[PDB]
């Protein structure tokens, strides 16, 4: 069962926060701070409302070592 089918989801009215993951069209994205409600691709420059994540699952290997 998918790692990316248990992620939180965004709500259209809600202003989003620091980089938790939210999902849409069964992929995810990550907000940095308050959103623009614009496309992320076009905002791939100056200001970063939300990042468009290339993957769904987190990367292999874990630099955090469970302290």
Listed in sequence order, the residues at least 6 apart from 21 whose beta carbon sits closer than 8 Å to its beta carbon are 7, 8, 28, 29, 30, 53
Q: Using CA of residue 34, residue 52, residue 40, residue 42, what is the dihedral sign?
A: positive
Cα-trace Rg, the chain: 13
Report, in this order, helix, strand and coil percent for the chain, each rounded to 5.
10, 20, 75
Which residue spans within 5-56 are E strands per DSSP? 21-24, 27-31, 50-52
Q: How many CB atoms lie within 10 A of CB 36?
A: 13
Strand 21-24 versus strand 50-52 pairing type = unpaired
Q: Are 29 and 40 in contact (CB under 8 A)?
A: yes
């Amino acid at each position: 069962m998918d790692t990316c089918a248990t992620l939180p989801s965004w709500d259209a009215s809600t202003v989003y926060t620091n980089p938790q993951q939210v999902k849409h069209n069964s992929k995810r994205y990550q907000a940095n701070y308050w959103t623009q409600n614009q496309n992320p691709s076009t905002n791939s420059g100056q200001y970063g409302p939300w990042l468009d994540l290339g993957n769904c699952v987190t990367s292999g290997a874990h630099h955090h070592h469970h302290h």
